[PDB]
Design an enzyme around this catalytic site. Structure first.
Site, mmCIF file in Angstrom:
data_model
loop_
_atom_site.group_PDB
_atom_site.id
_atom_site.type_symbol
_atom_site.label_atom_id
_atom_site.label_comp_id
_atom_site.label_asym_id
_atom_site.label_seq_id
_atom_site.Cartn_x
_atom_site.Cartn_y
_atom_site.Cartn_z
ATOM 1 N N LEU A 19 0.813 -1.211 0.000
ATOM 2 C CA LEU A 19 0.000 0.000 0.000
ATOM 3 C C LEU A 19 0.854 1.272 0.000
ATOM 4 O O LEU A 19 0.449 2.302 -0.516
ATOM 5 C CB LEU A 19 -0.944 0.005 1.203
ATOM 6 C CG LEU A 19 -1.895 1.191 1.307
ATOM 7 C CD1 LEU A 19 -2.861 1.221 0.141
ATOM 8 C CD2 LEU A 19 -2.636 1.162 2.611
ATOM 9 N N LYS A 82 -13.648 3.346 17.448
ATOM 10 C CA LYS A 82 -14.118 3.338 18.810
ATOM 11 C C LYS A 82 -12.971 3.594 19.725
ATOM 12 O O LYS A 82 -11.865 3.766 19.254
ATOM 13 C CB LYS A 82 -14.858 2.042 19.158
ATOM 14 C CG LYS A 82 -16.169 1.881 18.399
ATOM 15 C CD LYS A 82 -16.899 0.607 18.766
ATOM 16 C CE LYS A 82 -17.251 0.543 20.237
ATOM 17 N NZ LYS A 82 -17.980 -0.695 20.560
ATOM 18 N N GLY A 119 -11.202 -3.366 8.202
ATOM 19 C CA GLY A 119 -12.279 -4.184 8.650
ATOM 20 C C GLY A 119 -11.960 -5.640 8.402
ATOM 21 O O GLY A 119 -12.794 -6.401 7.896
ATOM 22 N N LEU A 122 -7.593 -6.215 13.668
ATOM 23 C CA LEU A 122 -7.949 -6.133 15.094
ATOM 24 C C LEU A 122 -9.312 -5.497 15.267
ATOM 25 O O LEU A 122 -9.920 -5.567 16.326
ATOM 26 C CB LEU A 122 -6.889 -5.393 15.937
ATOM 27 C CG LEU A 122 -5.498 -6.052 16.072
ATOM 28 C CD1 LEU A 122 -4.720 -6.050 14.760
ATOM 29 C CD2 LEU A 122 -4.706 -5.386 17.169
ATOM 30 N N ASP A 123 -9.747 -4.849 14.206
ATOM 31 C CA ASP A 123 -11.067 -4.246 14.085
ATOM 32 C C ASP A 123 -12.170 -5.326 14.150
ATOM 33 O O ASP A 123 -13.313 -5.031 14.494
ATOM 34 C CB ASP A 123 -11.142 -3.493 12.760
ATOM 35 C CG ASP A 123 -10.729 -4.375 11.609
ATOM 36 O OD1 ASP A 123 -11.449 -5.305 11.292
ATOM 37 O OD2 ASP A 123 -9.616 -4.175 11.044
HETATM 38 N N1 LIG Z 1 1.902 -2.007 3.976
HETATM 39 C C1 LIG Z 1 0.873 -2.709 3.530
HETATM 40 N N2 LIG Z 1 0.422 -2.533 2.277
HETATM 41 C C2 LIG Z 1 -0.616 -3.243 1.825
HETATM 42 N N3 LIG Z 1 -1.220 -4.130 2.599
HETATM 43 C C3 LIG Z 1 -0.804 -4.336 3.854
HETATM 44 C C4 LIG Z 1 0.251 -3.628 4.345
HETATM 45 N N4 LIG Z 1 0.459 -4.015 5.599
HETATM 46 C C5 LIG Z 1 -0.448 -4.953 5.888
HETATM 47 N N5 LIG Z 1 -1.220 -5.150 4.794
HETATM 48 C C6 LIG Z 1 -2.345 -6.153 4.626
HETATM 49 O O1 LIG Z 1 -3.608 -5.517 4.404
HETATM 50 C C7 LIG Z 1 -4.330 -5.555 5.637
HETATM 51 C C8 LIG Z 1 -3.990 -4.368 6.563
HETATM 52 O O2 LIG Z 1 -5.190 -3.765 7.078
HETATM 53 P P1 LIG Z 1 -5.687 -4.110 8.577
HETATM 54 O O3 LIG Z 1 -4.866 -3.448 9.637
HETATM 55 O O4 LIG Z 1 -5.615 -5.722 8.722
HETATM 56 O O5 LIG Z 1 -7.241 -3.705 8.677
HETATM 57 P P2 LIG Z 1 -7.679 -2.323 9.387
HETATM 58 O O6 LIG Z 1 -9.145 -2.040 9.318
HETATM 59 O O7 LIG Z 1 -6.829 -1.136 8.683
HETATM 60 O O8 LIG Z 1 -7.163 -2.393 10.901
HETATM 61 C C9 LIG Z 1 -7.425 -1.307 11.788
HETATM 62 C C10 LIG Z 1 -7.849 -1.826 13.194
HETATM 63 O O9 LIG Z 1 -6.767 -2.401 13.905
HETATM 64 C C11 LIG Z 1 -6.083 -1.322 14.542
HETATM 65 O O10 LIG Z 1 -5.136 -0.671 13.645
HETATM 66 C C12 LIG Z 1 -7.183 -0.289 14.997
HETATM 67 O O11 LIG Z 1 -7.533 -0.493 16.333
HETATM 68 C C13 LIG Z 1 -8.376 -0.617 14.059
HETATM 69 O O12 LIG Z 1 -9.549 -0.921 14.742
HETATM 70 C C14 LIG Z 1 -3.937 -6.895 6.332
HETATM 71 O O13 LIG Z 1 -4.711 -7.949 5.853
HETATM 72 C C15 LIG Z 1 -2.457 -7.058 5.914
HETATM 73 O O14 LIG Z 1 -2.175 -8.379 5.605
#
Ligand SMILES: Nc1ncnc2c1ncn2[C@@H]1O[C@H](COP(=O)(O)OP(=O)(O)OC[C@H]2O[C@@H](O)[C@H](O)[C@@H]2O)[C@@H](O)[C@H]1O
Length: 150
Positions: A19, A82, A119, A122-123
């Site tokens: 990303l 949240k 989503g 940890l969400d």
């Molecule tokens: N640098 C990256 N580039 C592309 N994809 C990535 C990268 N790093 C991780 N990923 C992949 O894409 C997803 C990353 O998004 P997530 O953190 O898994 O989902 P998200 O909704 O953003 O998480 C946020 C939740 O957790 C805490 O950060 C916070 O409390 C919130 O509720 C994961 O499946 C991971 O494998």
């Protein structure tokens, strides 16, 4: 091969790749809690590169809001879910924050937004419900959404 960057007539484009490899005209979005913990999931890299953590607390954003930072000419959207990571975000509250992104994007002329699989971490959310909701909110926009999936 075409020199213009045409979308394929879709809202969420699924691509496997990092990303952070996204262009400066293409803004990043992701969800975090009110306590703002980046030390979990993909959020770590954003904190490190864009230095968002203090700035977010500096702006004071709470559940149902979005915190945005202009960094490297692009925007960084922090959807405030949240209070903490031990709390499960609701889709309605997430929708509230999604609406705020579209409103900001169109206003500034930000037609390019990339995000990871939000989503899905940890969400504790279900992507089928999350994605479709994003796809509705941004259904009629010039915003090109691409999710980078790792
Ligand atoms: N640098 C990256 N580039 C592309 N994809 C990535 C990268 N790093 C991780 N990923 C992949 O894409 C997803 C990353 O998004 P997530 O953190 O898994 O989902 P998200 O909704 O953003 O998480 C946020 C939740 O957790 C805490 O950060 C916070 O409390 C919130 O509720 C994961 O499946 C991971 O494998």
């Amino acid at each position: 091969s075409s020199l213009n960057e045409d979308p394929e007539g879709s809202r969420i484009t699924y691509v496997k790749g990092d990303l952070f490899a996204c262009p400066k005209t293409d803004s990043l979005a992701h969800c975090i809690s009110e306590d703002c913990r980046m030390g979990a999931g993909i959020a770590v890299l954003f904190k490190k590169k864009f230095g968002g953590v203090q700035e977010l607390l500096n702006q004071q954003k709470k559940s149902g809001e979005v915190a945005v930072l202009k960094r490297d000419g692009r925007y960084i959207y922090y959807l405030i879910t949240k209070k903490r990571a031990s709390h499960k975000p609701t889709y309605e509250n997430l929708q509230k924050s999604l609406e705020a992104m579209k409103s900001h994007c169109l206003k500034n002329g930000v037609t390019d937004l990339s995000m990871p699989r939000i989503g899905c971490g940890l969400d504790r959310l279900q992507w089928e419900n999350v994605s479709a909701m994003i796809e509705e909110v941004f259904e009629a926009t010039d915003i090109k959404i691409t999710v980078y999936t790792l």
